[PDB]
């Protein structure tokens, strides 16, 4: 598995892979792992698929449910805390073999200038948490791989599709050094799920779009 | 009035015991002869609570026999505790003495019992057999000849006090007792004593042909 | 063990072999191992044969109960949902040898297309699911071969009376690779049993109809 | 309305107390000297507490045994605790005072007891014995000569009040004591804190011995 | 009616303050003198809370000798917690009023007793003695001179109004608190918050002493 | 640590060495390791050092607790079955390092014969107790040395002062025999000590008795 | 240990013998191994001496405990069913070194045939109980010498004295064959233990009978 | 990670290091891990980072309950007790793996002499507490070379200026000596955090000064 | 770690050293070991530091509770039971690494004869406890030297001058002889504390006086190694 995310002038891009495997044998080829969390936050979690999908779900009931009952969203850091809170609880099953890591990329609006106001946040297994200053951040198997690539690779993104090109890109490399994360599937024409956040929110991207730049990708490689 | 619900129980109590019948427990020279008016023959108002202690009762049934069962459950509890020897009629006494006092005091209603605990010698050991009488309402007394509960007390203790005879065969101790509560044959009688020169175990019933030889 | 389904246009069609071992040694020769859940779902689990009548008892009467206390049957979500919560929680017994793994089939009534309503779900031994969209899955240790074996047969698939036969082929397949399945007895005339589930619900599959696929299958392979 | 029950109880108390039978208490040279009208011969109105601690009272028997009972386990546990010189009659006192007077706020109806606690010195020492009484209510007085409780006090209290004498002997304190209660050693309790004994001062006079010494 | 229960409350706790002993407790120069009348010599009304601060109260004993034995636990339990300087006497006066307006309201009756807090700077630091008064109803006063409790306060108030003298020595402090108390040793308690003391400032002075100063 | 008892015509007497060690280290030189009880026993425990002395003192406190609240002192068998079920009781910690043997001897006020009426009472780690009949018993670390001792003296013994001299030479035997066992030092003048108990009672042995005593045993067997 | 049981017209006999071990060493030569619990049953018990007793009080007080508060004893089935109870509970300390196995012999008053109410019952550590129709049985170390000779010796049993010989002489044969079980004592005058149950209720067998069968075993023995 | 703080007279000091390690992979450059609790407090924690983040928000949000529920703030003993507390608490945690080791250097305002009102308390891994007298002390992987430099440094510490600057060249060694001690980063622009606390509390060192500092360390060292 | 305690006519005296040790590395230099738990006992406690600290604290506070609570301060042997009850407690804390054993050491102002009022209490990891009635007693890695220097040294002291004289003696040959023990530090004039109980209560010696007798003991072990030699050869 490998989840990437990346900061653009106005906003944030998250994506992700769709392989899950059962050490070398192929299990599936359609996961989703980037969730929607709310209306200005994207979550992608790594790990034990089972782990990632109860996390997801249960940290956006928590998030709907505080601001339902107090009538007023949480702030950023407020859902920071809550996240961290729950992977560090996590730990003991975590140690059993349950590990989740999660990897949290938002847009405050509260934030002073709106050029600026994407946010990328990384997790430990312990719990701590840091808010990523270098404007890229990945977690997952081919994590390293897919940070390397971002590492040459980000002097390119000037906007929210060259952002995208970049993420799909990084995610090619991670899946062309980790057999654990699975490549553009052309043959079935299955390709990695995106979430653009901006300050009108956080809307999935087609699949068409990211089937285009992949396969201009695949081109660019193949010549 | 706390004054006018102690009477108010006080006279429950006791119009609770009157009614019912009379229990007689003598001491002779083998120990001490229990001798109760129960016309029933499943329910019975003697029992033994331990080696060398007796038990009797008279007032409403299904509350002495829950005493009696306590004071078992006590008696076999300190006798495996530290020794069978070091439980004595005294404990079980005062025990039945502090529990009638709070069931007296802070129950609804009372306990219509008069209870009767008697302990005799140990075996090869001379001593005067004890016997205690509790109330309803807890007090305590130690009776050196005779104790006499239930129904109409007053002519069975004067019958009792004129004819008491000290160191008295268990015949003649069975006639006497008899003879002052009917002032009642097998079938309406229970009688048990406390054979002082049993070993261990001094309680024993006399019953059937033996009782009505013994009359 | 080993259990199939797979989607035909209409409906769905799950079936499971009959043979139980303790070992090496065969204990059990008739063993039922598809229940019909409720009206539109049919539920197969592998594993400890204990734990599967189990956890078929306990999902079915849990179903039920639902239904019947607030008057309306539970969506298609919900049931994946209790049944990876069962799973779940069976996870400390499984560690020490009792694991179960079940296989969801069912029918949606709320789905927008009829020919596409039939569904089938997966789960893992961390009580994940999965909705499978590849058509067909399968369960247990002979599981792997059934999967190869539909991966070839599964473009043979029109109707249900084919997917009923690609599904019998692939447990033929099945027992003819792994020892633990069970095959067609032709001798004590025992053959796996099949349920079909539609929009008219589902149904038991006759013993009959299971037993000429079966001789088919044989004679077409003599 | 409270002053009315306050009332109500304290002629309780008193009308139950002045029914029972009565208890004297005085220090003499040897120690202390309890002499109790007990006509029976199982039941005991003076016990001991601790090794130089003495127990007397008098009203309801059930209710002063079992304040008896937990004074005892409070010593015992007091001793064990931190030391057996650590446990003085004061503490015991303290903690009867309390507890009798939370009785006599809180349960329905308030004990009708009367306690006098003795303590004398350690082996070696030299130390006036104290003697402490406590009442229904809670009050607790120390009294530096001799305590009468239960019954008709205040004969017995101007009796020993023009024949009291310090440093009297033990015939002498037991005389005092027999001739201030009237206004036999079968119907008599007597026991002594004897100062004299090394560790357990508490010992009780019966039988022919008592008939010597009256 | 709960202003007729009020009332009750009131009348009873005002009726047994003042059936007891009086307590007067005034700053001087080198701290904080206690002067009560006390004839037991088992009994005492003026205790130690903490290093810096003293105890003292007037009414029914067995209620304010609890008081006092919970407000040494809390001053320990606080002072072994964070520090020993973090205990002051405004936390000890706060917790003794809300504890008694909680007995006030909720408890069958309230307790009559009215509590004396007083706190002396520490060792080498300069600052006037504080004291507080707890009434039964949980109502704290803080006075900057002197205190009176217990008894008829109104001439002991006057008394102490008229003869006050702040920087005071001890003996004139003491002089001045027994006139207004009369308006011997045998029948006082003395009591003292020694400021000049390094760590413990609480100390009795009793026998000769208390007599010299007499 | 050798505690010897046996039986003389009379009355019982028990003695105790005063020598602790912590491994070969010598540690104590006067430790007192016979406690009398009450009026009529004596305890003996054998072991560590702490535990010994916490089950005397707990012991004693129990058996004064219930002659105090009963008014009647425990029956022999009694005692016995108190200290029985401490023992038992002692178990779990015993298997972990702190063991404690006790040694219970005593005069029986309502036995028949006066002359018969000591006891000697042996206890084992589970708790079993033995009542005595050979007359002489032993606990300890030198232990047999000293009970083989008493086997081939016991039959001098007549009265006390004959029991009291054959237990001062069965613990310097003992003494002699085990090193963890401390023999008469005549240098510092610390001798082991005694208790005798019969018809009136329970009394401590004065220092200068046993110390004459263990000199003339020592300038027996110096010549 | 050991303990035997056997069934003669008319009645019932238990005995057992006196020794008590701590590995090679003797540290007891008169226990008392065979209890009579009530009128008319007596239980032996082998391995743990601690165990054993305590099993047999709290057995004898269980069984006076259900009689006092009844007014009727227990059938004999009702007191196999809190034996084996008591065994079954036992399991945990019997795993940890504290077993005891105990052997129930009785006499059914209840019984139709009064030749043929002889009752001898054995146990396991699992709580299991079989009433034995063989007329023998024994426990303890030295059990299986013992039934080895009253196999060849229950053909001379005829009545109460036959049968207590026999058993004596079984006694002899498993402490001949075993060190854990002491033999007839002739130096201190020590005999094992016997319990005769029949119509008449339950007595002890005086020592001297005891002792002249033993006597005459070993003169036989001799040549 | 390594933390230092020293002494100067009118005020104290503290600094830190910007890197965080997961093993040998740099994970983190731009930590702060230098505190303000309140006004005239700093701590500075080593070890897991999510730990010390953890310590250093629950510490300041006690002593600020206890300021606003008594209106008084606690003395420094106290607060050095409440830390001391929490490390004690925290052993079953970090014997685990998750270790964290406070450093607590402060102003006391109540303090005699104005000049000497500085205090460094260091504290171990059992809660143990010691307040330094040697006007310096360290904590983390890199102390010992720190402390080492700082006290060949320490007597050119004259005010804070000079103080500051001889805490920046300790953590210079630190990082020179120390792979998991990041050094102030040229290409990047991130230098270590300092805080100085002096009568008028406790403020945030600018970036600036400590980037000029750097600078002439690293030219200084050069040549 | 090293704590010695010694009885002298009149009073006892009780000196500990100053260092703390982290394995082979010096992390303490200045810790004060011996505490003043009332005004006639001190109690020095030796092994963990943090433990040692802890139990001083939680003991006076134990101390002064009851006496405020009761009025009366505790006998002699109940401050004994309630030290020996808080070790056995630790047992479990002990067997983990947390070990602490402490030293008690007293007047007893109702002991009945003022000059042996004095009394030194040893414990053991149990919680057992033994009133040592030798006249000294150490404990500490380093005890064995100083109570072996006190056993050769104890027949100068006849007051509490000659005691304190011992008891930094000792100290010094048990620093001599362990590593773990810090001796007198002449250079940062670091030196270990004392302090001396007598009818008068107990008072914390000045350093200057124990920093005289350290160097008086310096100079004449100097002066004897400068007399003596290994036989004949230096």
């Given at each position: 598995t490998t989840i990437v995310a990346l900061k653009y002038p106005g906003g944030v891009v998250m994506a992700g892979?769709?392989?899950?495997?059962?050490?070398?044998?192929?299990?599936?080829?359609?996961?989703?792992?980037?969730?929607?969390?709310?209306?200005?936050?994207?979550?992608?979690?790594?790990?034990?698929?089972?782990?990632a999908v109860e996390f997801a779900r249960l940290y956006a009931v928590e998030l709907e449910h505080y601001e339902k009952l107090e009538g007023v969203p949480?702030?950023?850091?407020?859902?920071?805390?809550?996240?961290?809170?729950?992977?560090?609880?996590?730990?003991?099953?975590?140690?059993?073999?349950?590990?989740?890591?999660?990897?949290?990329?938002?847009?405050?609006?509260?934030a002073s200038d709106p050029?600026?106001?994407?946010?990328?946040?990384?997790?430990?297994?312990?719990?701590?948490?840091?808010?990523?200053?270098?404007?890229?951040?990945?977690?997952?198997?081919?994590?390293?791989?897919?940070?390397?690539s971002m590492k040459k690779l980000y002097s390119q993104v000037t906007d929210g599709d060259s952002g995208l090109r970049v993420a799909v890109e990084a995610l090619y490399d991670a899946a062309d050094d980790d057999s654990a994360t699975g490549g553009p599937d052309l043959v079935r024409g299955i390709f990695p799920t995106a979430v653009i956040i901006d300050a009108d929110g956080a809307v999935d991207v087609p699949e068409s779009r990211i089937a285009e730049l992949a396969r201009a990708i695949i081109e660019s490689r193949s010549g | 009035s706390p004054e006018q619900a102690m009477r108010e129980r006080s006279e429950l109590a006791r119009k609770g015991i009157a009614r019912a019948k009379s229990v007689v427990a003598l001491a002779y020279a083998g120990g001490v002869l229990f001798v109760a008016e129960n016309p029933s023959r499943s329910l019975q108002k003697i029992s033994e609570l331990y080696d060398r202690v007796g038990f009797a009762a008279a007032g409403k049934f299904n509350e002495f026999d829950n005493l009696r069962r306590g004071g078992i459950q006590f008696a076999d509890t300190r006798?495996?505790?530290?020794?069978?020897?070091?439980?004595?009629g005294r404990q079980l006494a005062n025990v039945y003495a502090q529990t009638l006092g709070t069931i007296f005091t802070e129950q609804a209603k009372?306990?219509?019992?008069?209870?009767?605990?008697?302990?005799?010698?140990?075996?090869?050991?001379?001593?005067?057999?004890?016997?205690?009488?509790?109330?309803?309402?807890?007090?305590?007394?130690?009776?050196?000849?005779?104790?006499?509960?239930?129904?109409?007390?007053?002519?069975?203790?004067?019958?009792?006090?004129?004819?008491?005879?000290?160191?008295?065969?268990?015949?003649?101790?069975?006639?006497?007792?008899?003879?002052?509560?009917?002032?009642?044959?097998?079938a309406s009688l229970?009688?048990?004593?406390?054979?002082?020169?049993?070993?261990?175990?001094?309680?024993?019933?006399?019953?059937?042909?033996?009782?009505?030889?013994?009359?």
């Open positions: 892979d769709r392989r899950s495997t059962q050490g070398n044998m192929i299990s599936g080829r359609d996961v989703r792992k980037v969730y929607i969390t709310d209306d200005y936050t994207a979550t992608g979690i790594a790990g034990t698929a089972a782990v949480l702030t950023f850091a407020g859902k920071i805390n809550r996240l961290a809170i729950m992977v560090r609880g996590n730990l003991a099953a975590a140690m059993q073999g349950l590990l989740a890591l999660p990897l949290l990329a938002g847009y405050d609006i509260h050029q600026s106001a994407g946010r990328i946040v990384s997790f430990d297994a312990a719990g701590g948490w840091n808010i990523e200053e270098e404007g890229y951040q990945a977690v997952g198997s081919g994590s390293l791989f897919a940070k390397s | 006798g495996y505790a530290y020794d069978r020897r070091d439980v004595t009372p306990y219509e019992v008069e209870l009767c605990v008697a302990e005799v010698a140990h075996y090869g050991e001379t001593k005067r057999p004890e016997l205690y009488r509790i109330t309803y309402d807890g007090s305590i007394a130690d009776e050196p000849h005779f104790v006499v509960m239930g129904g109409t007390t007053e002519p069975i203790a004067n019958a009792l006090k004129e004819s008491y005879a000290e160191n008295a065969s268990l015949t003649d101790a069975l006639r006497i007792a008899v003879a002052a509560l009917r002032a009642l044959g097998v229970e009688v048990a004593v406390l054979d002082a020169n049993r070993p261990r175990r001094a309680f024993r019933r006399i019953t059937g042909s033996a009782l009505q030889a013994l009359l």
